[PDB]
């Protein structure tokens, strides 16, 4: 029996409200969970909030709320943003969540009996912003927001603080030998491959341990405690990066109330087929994690997807610089699928680009309505297919077969891309195999073969509306809302939209009645800017 497909976003700091870049891992996520159900696979993904340390106890403190009300305030801020973006998340976890409290420290327990763990001092730097230990080779001097000089991060620009406390330190550098051996012996673990090469360059050079604890009082009491010593509490990064493992073993109930199996075998999700995060958080999951998880002997994940950063003035949008837009009001004015369909296909994982409304809405104009939704309304209009359904082809052209061929083809390319993972080139696949459609539709001119050659008609009907079919059932997992708005027009029957027994050509039965569109109905609306 397969492995569930197994894949998570990162947990989110609840230090302020989401944004486009939560929204976007969010998306990644959901559009591989989507192909995969589609494929006929077991599907579980995740995404959650993280809830613990000194950068979320700081936020609650600005605002004048306790921890508590203030974590679950703006959790209930990331779920609903969610919904809100018709995500189809199979768990969402909170660290707050007694099940992971408890599941944190039976690691913490496990990470101690290997002997992986010694009481010592770190004596470095610290980015609170980012919880994030720094060397003396990653700092400069800079300055902060009032103009006063000051030590900032080289990962990102933020105030570092001197921190001198006792600490619980992991042996990370007793790891380098066996990380840099499975870096090796697995290509492909993360992607794209030039972060996989600054990890393998970063290892190379030597890895220093990694404090795992802080005294609670430098966390404001709001971080899980070191078992067996209350005096400390757990990291908050080692806390967070666990939550994958809480969400393999997590089993949710009728009433909502979650157990923990005591093993991953039996709900069979466990490891990651994809990680995905943002580069900010590349070193945590590329190095630490795998760490935690060969001292905790468990499974490593198969792949980390580390992708770039969304940028106002191409400067990161960040909750901790207030330069960002209201995602889901964006997703409103523009359309929430012609905004999943931008930031998937204008995107590639290794960019960092501006998030431009011009850019989107040529793509929604230019893409979305006039190829796709174009094809749609030729596909169903009463004057080309005056019966309303599938029409029985007749005998093939070499044209045809050609098209024919492309579409054939197109499940080999998308499923590749969509597995490896790649989405924006599943994509643009996708869109190269509509635009021949689309071509093939007006070479054949179907409103001129009306009650004049009603066998060719069928034929270019017949080859165009499985076509379209195709196409739309691989765009279900970035458009699931457009993309069943289309099978609904086709009447495409619901067994026929998923299975890999549909992806080739020749699926739908003639004679199958279509629902068709309304008179000035059309699946995108066009925009103009100002
Ligand atoms: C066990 S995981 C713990 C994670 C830790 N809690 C944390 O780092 O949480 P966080 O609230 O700072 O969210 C950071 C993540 O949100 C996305 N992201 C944020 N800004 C983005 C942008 N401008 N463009 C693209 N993606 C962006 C991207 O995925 C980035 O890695
Ligand atoms: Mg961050
Ligand atoms: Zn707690």
């Known amino acids: ?8 976003t990162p947990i989110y700091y609840v230090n302020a409200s989401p944004h486009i870049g939560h929204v976007y891992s969010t998306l990644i996520v959901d559009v591989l969970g989507r192909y995969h159900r589609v494929k006929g696979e077991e599907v579980f993904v995740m995404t ?41 998340m199979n768990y969402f976890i909170r660290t707050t969540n007694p099940t992971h409290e408890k599941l944190v420290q039976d690691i913490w327990k496990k990470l101690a009996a290997k002997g992986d763990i010694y009481l010592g001092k770190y004596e470095g730097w610290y980015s609170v912003s980012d919880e994030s230990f720094l060397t003396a080779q ?22 570092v603080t001197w921190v001198e406390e006792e600490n619980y330190m992991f042996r990370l550098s007793a790891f380098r030998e066996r990380l840099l051996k499975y870096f090796h012996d697995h290509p492909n673990c993360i992607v794209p491959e030039f972060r996989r090469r600054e990890v393998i360059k970063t290892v190379e050079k030597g890895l220093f341990d990694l404090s795992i604890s802080r005294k609670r009082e430098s966390v404001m009491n709001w971080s899980i405690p070191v078992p067996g010593d209350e005096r400390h509490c757990i990291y908050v990064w080692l806390d967070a990066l666990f939550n994958y493992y809480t969400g393999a073993l997590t089993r949710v109930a009728t009433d ?97 680009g501006d998030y431009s409304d011009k850019n989107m809405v040529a793509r929604l104009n230019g893409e979305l309505a006039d190829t796709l939704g174009n094809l749609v309304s030729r596909c169903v209009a009463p004057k080309i297919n005056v019966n309303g359904m599938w029409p029985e082809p007749a005998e093939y052209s070499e044209s045809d077969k050609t098209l024919i061929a492309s579409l ?98 020749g699926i739908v039965k003639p004679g199958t009645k279509i629902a068709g569109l309304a008179e000035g109905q059309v699946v995108f609306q066009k925009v103009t800017l100002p």
């Open 256 to 352: 909502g109330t979650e157990t923990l199996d005591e093993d991953h075998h039996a709900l069979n999700r466990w490891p990651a087929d994809v990680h995905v995060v943002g580069k900010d958080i590349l070193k945590f999951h590329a190095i630490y994690w795998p760490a935690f998880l060969m001292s905790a002997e468990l499974p490593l994940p198969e792949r980390l997807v580390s992708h770039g950063w969304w940028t106002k003035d191409h400067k990161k949008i960040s909750k901790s610089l207030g330069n960002a837009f209201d995602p889901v009001e964006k997703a409103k004015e523009f359309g929430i699928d012609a905004l999943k369909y931008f930031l998937m296909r204008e995107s590639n994982f290794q960019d960092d």
């Open 48 to 88: 959650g909030t993280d809830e613990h340390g000194q950068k979320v106890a700081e936020a609650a403190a600005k605002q004048g709320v306790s921890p508590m009300d203030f974590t679950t305030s703006v959790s209930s801020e990331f779920k609903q943003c969610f919904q809100e973006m018709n995500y189809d």
């Open 408 to 505: 054939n083809n197109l499940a080999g390319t998308v499923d590749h891309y969509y597995c490896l993972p790649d989405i924006q080139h599943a994509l643009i696949a996708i869109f190269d195999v509509l635009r021949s459609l689309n071509a093939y539709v007006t070479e054949n001119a179907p409103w001129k073969l009306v009650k004049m050659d009603t066998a060719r008609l069928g034929t270019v009907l017949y080859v165009t509306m499985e076509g379209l079919r195709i196409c739309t059932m691989f765009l279900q997992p970035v458009m699931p809302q457009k993309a069943k708005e289309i099978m609904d027009a086709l009447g495409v029957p619901e067994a026929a939209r998923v299975g890999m027994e549909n992806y080739l050509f």
């Open 1 to 8: 029996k397969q492995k569930v497909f197994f894949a998570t």
């Open 138 to 159: 990653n700092v400069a001097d800079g300055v902060d927001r009032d103009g006063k000089p000051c030590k900032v991060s080289l990962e990102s620009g933020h105030v």
